[PDB]
Nucleic acid binder design. Structure first.
Lengths: 219, 27, 283
RNA sequence: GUCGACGUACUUCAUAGGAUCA
RNA sequence: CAAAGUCUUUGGGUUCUGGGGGGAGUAUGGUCGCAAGGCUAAAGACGGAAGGGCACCACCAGGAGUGGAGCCUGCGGCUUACACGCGCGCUACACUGACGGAGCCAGCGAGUCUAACCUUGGCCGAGAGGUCUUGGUAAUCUUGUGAAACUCCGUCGUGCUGGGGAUAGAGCAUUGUAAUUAUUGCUCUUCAACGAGGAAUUCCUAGUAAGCGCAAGUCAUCAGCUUGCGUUGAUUACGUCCCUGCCCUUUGUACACACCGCCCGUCGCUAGUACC
């Protein structure tokens, strides 16, 4: 469902992105930020050096930006992620776990960065709806009739996993090739206040030392 | 895997027993 | 458009059909597949016939990723205008305005089915399952009880339906005789049309109308002209002869006095044979 | 025969109305 | 409602009927009922061309590098109740240096009631470490966190020395029940490699690369790490499409003024007609 964070702007305007990092990235973390940049369309990035975050985000807001992603790491490899939707939108704070690197494996073609095709798989609860709408409103509005860049979100077992695949409509079926990174993505908080607040309305926190969260998805 | 298979066993057994006590009474 | 909401009459309808693991179910008017998926478990191959491509699209969406995804064909269009493939039992919910076509289309199939579980309106089904002498023995019962055999299963009361309609429904097992018997169809139907016009007047009444004697005179002439035997002197037109002819049959076989809504099937056979023996045919 | 019409036995659906306060 | 009346609870005569209504259901040791069948057999699509924008996955210039050393550390061999393959960081490889003294500019927050936190001072002990107290339940006390690089002179001469401390041993505090498996902190002593690092190699266009310190570990990741906080602070590009790859059109199709005035090839759909 489209939300008050998106109702006036969902299909109205196509978005732009900004990719940045917490403080003094490692080189491989910068390379992974490069991958997540080149995966997204409308991709422009900027290194954060000695920046006060209220000043940084506030200055980025008058210049006009739809969303801001910023990363974290643990001794070279990244672990966390957050999205801040600018017009008082909700920041979402995730834990990302696994990765494959286009640098690492092979040069398997090109991330053509065309307005890609979107896949959101197996989301039922209203939190799944929140994640779907927040993430859908980051992709470009208007892929073509045959946009061959299929991005894939899968929501099995509370660990949403993303891949990119490129298909050609061959004689009896489509055929796909694996590109982009492959992920174990998992959220732990939603705050409707933008991260500049530090104290605003938290929508959602993952209960951790609750027994039943062994089993239950979505808190 | 253990905790799941326990949950489906427990649900089926409980529901079926309640269904038998729904199968007897308005006969 | 009504929806069988009750999730317990559905299973009973299915398992009374005695689906073998090598059957081809025709399943006419599947609806939203509340019923279908059970048949997919128990049959090798299902052929669902549908007219609403909205329902067809949703129904074929239901089976995706399911192991039974490849054992279901869908045929679109009007049911009474397709060519049904071979099918081996038939299970039907379809809205009731085709209840009388459907039955005869199944009876007149080439290689008909073996058993079919059909849902009907209560008074319609009680026409089908009415023995000679009941209040409801109609012409429909005499046809269908010649070529098939029809047995009640249950009552489906009207509050298992969304929205609740006004008429009660029945579930009926119909099972075609095999071989179909070797009386004609069109002679059987001609005779039943005549003698069942007024169900409780005696049989000789139905052979008094002047439309009917015109029809029989025309048929008798065309029969003689089929065998090329030229015609005698008639005091009115030819029906004169036919008149006493008819009376003579209704003297011998005694049936010219019994009332046609109390005469069972062998009596119609004896009457049919007696008119055939003296040169009368009904189509 | 998951058959019908009864005859017994039982189950269930329909309960809020005025007055003041927030 | 002139009967549906007969002054509060009831008698003028007499015939008949009811034992509880409406909508759905379920069961049955009960009563009456209710079939047919025994020979018959389907299987529009495809290749090419040109026209305009894009990229530290392109060009140009370099900055910082890693890959050298040493040490910690994330995925890969083999073992227990150790000879290893892919990667991330810090420290140095010395005179812009190294040690002795002088001067010094922050911000982020944190902190204790029936507990001892965060603290000030005086004290003594090289130090490590022990002394009682107020300040603070918070701008108040830390706290101006007097931070580090930084600046001056002093010492020293390129020396693998005084750069360098991996490496050990001993003593000291200091816990804790024990440190024992140098848990930690001081002190002394030991003084390795490292003489600038090939093949390759990533990131990068200004408060930027780079270098320095202070704070907190707030339900996920994190402890020789992470995330904040601030400090100092530059060079070259701010141009191009040559290659690489990406996007837009082939009716410019959209309305004066300045341009021109068929997308191309292959298999298609169908029509026609000479032919057998």
């Amino acid at each position: 469902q489209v939300d008050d964070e998106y109702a006036a702007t969902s299909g109205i305007m196509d978005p732009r992105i900004i990719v940045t990092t917490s403080r003094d990235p490692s080189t491989r973390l910068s390379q992974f930020a490069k991958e997540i940049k080149l995966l997204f369309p409308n991709a422009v990035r900027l290194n954060r050096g000695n920046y006060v975050m209220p000043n940084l985000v506030d200055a980025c807001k008058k210049s006009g930006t739809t969303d801001l992603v910023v990363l974290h790491e643990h001794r070279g490899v990244p672990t966390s992620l957050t999205i801040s939707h600018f017009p008082h939108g909700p920041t979402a704070q995730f834990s990302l776990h696994n990765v494959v690197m286009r640098h690492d494996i092979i040069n398997a073609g090109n991330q053509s960065e065309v307005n890609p095709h979107l896949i959101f798989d197996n989301f039922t609860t209203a939190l799944g709806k929140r994640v779907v709408c927040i993430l859908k409103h980051l992709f470009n509005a208007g892929p073509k009739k045959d946009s061959e860049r299929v991005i894939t979100f899968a929501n099995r077992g509370d660990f949403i996993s993303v891949r990119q695949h490129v298909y050609v409509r061959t004689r009896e079926g489509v055929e796909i090739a694996e590109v982009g990174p492959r992920f174990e993505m998992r959220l732990f908080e939603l705050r409707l206040g933008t991260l500049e607040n530090k104290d605003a309305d938290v929508e959602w926190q993952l209960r951790r030392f609750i027994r039943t969260a062994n089993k239950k998805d979505y808190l | 895997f253990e905790a799941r298979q326990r949950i489906e066993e427990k649900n089926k057994e409980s529901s079926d027993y309640h269904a038998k006590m729904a199968h007897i009474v308005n006969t | 458009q009504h929806i069988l909401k009750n999730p317990l009459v559905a299973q009973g309808i299915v398992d009374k059909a005695q689906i073998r693991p090598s059957d081809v179910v025709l399943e006419v008017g599947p609806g939203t597949g509340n019923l279908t998926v059970r048949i997919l478990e128990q049959a090798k191959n299902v052929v669902a016939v549908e007219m609403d491509p909205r329902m067809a699209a949703e129904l074929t969406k239901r089976v995706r990723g399911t192991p039974v995804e490849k054992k279901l064909e869908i045929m679109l269009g009007d049911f009474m205008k397709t060519e049904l493939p071979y099918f081996d039992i038939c299970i039907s919910n379809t809205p009731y305005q085709i209840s009388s076509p459907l039955v005869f289309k199944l009876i007149n199939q080439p290689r008909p089915p073996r058993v079919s579980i059909l849902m009907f309106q209560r008074e319609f089904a009680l026409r089908l399952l009415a023995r000679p002498g009941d209040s409801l023995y109609c012409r429909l019962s005499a046809n269908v009880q010649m070529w098939a055999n029809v047995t009640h299963i249950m009552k489906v009361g009207k509050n298992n339906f969304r929205p609740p309609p006004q008429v009660e429904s029945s579930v009926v097992r119909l099972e075609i005789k095999n071989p179909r018997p070797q009386v004609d169809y069109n002679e059987w139907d001609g005779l039943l049309r005549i003698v069942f016009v007024r169900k409780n007047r005696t049989i000789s009444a139905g052979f008094k109308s002047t439309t009917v004697m015109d029809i029989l005179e025309k048929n008798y002439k065309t029969f003689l002209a089929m065998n090329n035997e030229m015609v005698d002197d008639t005091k009115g037109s030819m029906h004169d002869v036919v008149k006493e002819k008819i009376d003579t049959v209704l003297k011998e076989t005694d049936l010219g006095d019994k009332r046609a809504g109390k005469c069972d099937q062998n009596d119609f056979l004896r009457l049919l044979y007696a008119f055939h023996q003296v040169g009368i045919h009904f189509s």
